[PDB]
Amino acid sequence: QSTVPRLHRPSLQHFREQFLVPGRPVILKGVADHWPAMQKWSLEYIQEIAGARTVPVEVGSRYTDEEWSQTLMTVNEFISKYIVNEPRDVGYLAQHQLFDQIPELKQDISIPDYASLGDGEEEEITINAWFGPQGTISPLHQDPQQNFLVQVMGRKYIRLYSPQESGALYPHDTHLLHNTSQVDVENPDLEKFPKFAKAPFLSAILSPGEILFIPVKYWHYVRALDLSFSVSFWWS
Ligand SMILES: O=C(O)CNC(=O)C(=O)O
Ligand SMILES: [Mn+2]
């Protein structure tokens, strides 16, 4: 159990050799801290630019829950019901291609140059928004591409487990959830999942202007500590 390392604007070669090729997480500083988003994206700005648009919203504590569901509403409705007014349930505008929907917002972000070290096309990079209140939780899971998760507003608590530790994370048996752990990271049932207790991990609090590199297939768990807006870039 240790902290994810933080590096200020490392060279492309240093990132490639020490992090990308070996598949090791790192937080990059001084890279996204000057996105216009970092100063422009307030709730008021998001309402002005996106408020009338329809977005998918996940409702419930964790997508692994039984009562969890997905609905559609405007961004203004999402803010009113799940952020500003004392909300009744946790809602999360998660994993949504908001920048394709609202191209004006693309002007406020940039793809990190480190993504050019991959073997894929820039036109195939997928950019997703993650916008929600304090307390959203994305259960421990792994993704099939590299990721840069950029924090714009608020902070997130992140726990990372290597693919080498997959046995101790008890992936779901069904094919559709095989990329998700059965374990609740922050309150694990150690009578049912004893191997989880000894599995090593990295953790961090990701703050505005920071980029977390999540290597392909690295298991990650994310809880928002404040009202939060993150932007993920999936690339190969
Ligand atoms: O930010 C979150 O809640 C979860 N993020 C991701 O799983 C991701 O960027 O791939
Ligand atoms: Mn993910």
Ramachandran region of residue 160, left (φ > 0), alpha (ψ -120 to 50) or beta?
beta
Tell me if 138 CB under 6 Å of ligand 1. yes
14 is in an annotated binding site: no
Distance CA(173)–CA(182), nearest Å, equals: 9
Q: What is the DSSP string of 113-173?
A: GGGGGSSS-GGG-EEEEEEE-TT-EEEEE--SSEEEEEEEES-EEEEEE-GGGGGGG-B-S
d(CA 5, CA 109): 24
Q: Residue 227: in which H helix or E strand, if any?
A: none
CB contact set of 48 (below 8 Å; sequence gap of 6+): none
End-to-end CA distance of the chain: 28
Q: Which two tokens stand for residue 65?
A: 């829950």
Residue 206 sits at φ, ψ, to 5 deg, of -90, 125
Query: Could you give all domains of the chain from N- to C-terminal order, each with its CATH number?
Result: 1-236 (2.60.120.650)
Specify whether the CB–CB gap between 103 and 182 falls below 8 A: no
Which residues neighbour 13 within 8 Å (Cβ) at sequence distance 6 or greater? none
Q: Show the tokens assigned to 115.
A: 């993504």
Quick one: which ligand is closest to 94's CA?
A: 1
Ligand 1 pocket check for 130: Cβ under 6 Å: yes
Residue 220 CA to residue 216 CA, distance in Å, equals 11
Pick the ligand that lies closest to the CA of residue 137: 1
Report the distance separating Cα 151 and Cα 156, nearest Å. 8
Q: Ligand 1: does its nearest atom lie under 6 Å from the Cβ of 222?
A: yes
In degrees rounded to 5, what are phi and psi of residue 52? -85, -5
Nearest ligand, CA 147: 1
Q: Is 220 annotated as a binding residue?
A: yes
CB 218 within 8 A of CB 145: no
Neighbours of 225 (CB within 10 A): 15
Q: Please report how many Cα atoms fall inside a 13 Å half-sphere around the Cα of residue 155, on the Cβ side.
A: 6
Contact 228, 146 (CB under 8 A): no
Sign of the Cα torsion 175, 179, 185, 190 reads positive
Q: Which amino acid is at 107?
A: Q
Q: Is the CB of 129 inside a 6 Å radius of any atom of ligand 1? A: no
Taking CB atoms within 8 Å and a gap of at least 24, the contacts of 114-118 are 114/12, 114/15, 114/20, 114/28, 114/31, 114/148, 114/213, 115/146, 115/148, 115/233, 115/235, 116/12, 117/12, 117/15, 117/16, 117/20, 118/146, 118/235, 118/236
DSSP H helices, the chain, are 12-15, 37-40, 43-50, 75-79, 98-101, 103-106
Q: Ligand 1 pocket check: which of 90, 223, 232 to mutate, most ligand atoms within 8 Å of Cβ?
A: 232
Strands 69-74 and 54-59 come out as antiparallel
Mutate which of 137, 222, 231 for ligand 1? The one with the most ligand atoms within 8 Å of its CB, which is 222
Q: What is the resolution of this structure in A?
A: 1.5
Q: Is 232 annotated as a binding residue?
A: no
Q: 143-168 burial by CB neighbour count: b if 16+ within 10 A, else e? A: bebbbbbbbbbbbbbbbbbbeebeeb
Query: 85 labelled as ligand-binding?
Result: no
Tokens of 198: 């000894």
Q: In what order do the strands lie in the sheet with 211-214?
A: 6-8, 26-29, 211-214, 146-153, 228-235, 126-132, 91-96, 54-59, 69-74
CA Rg value for the chain: 18
Residue 80 gets which letter from DSSP? Answer: I
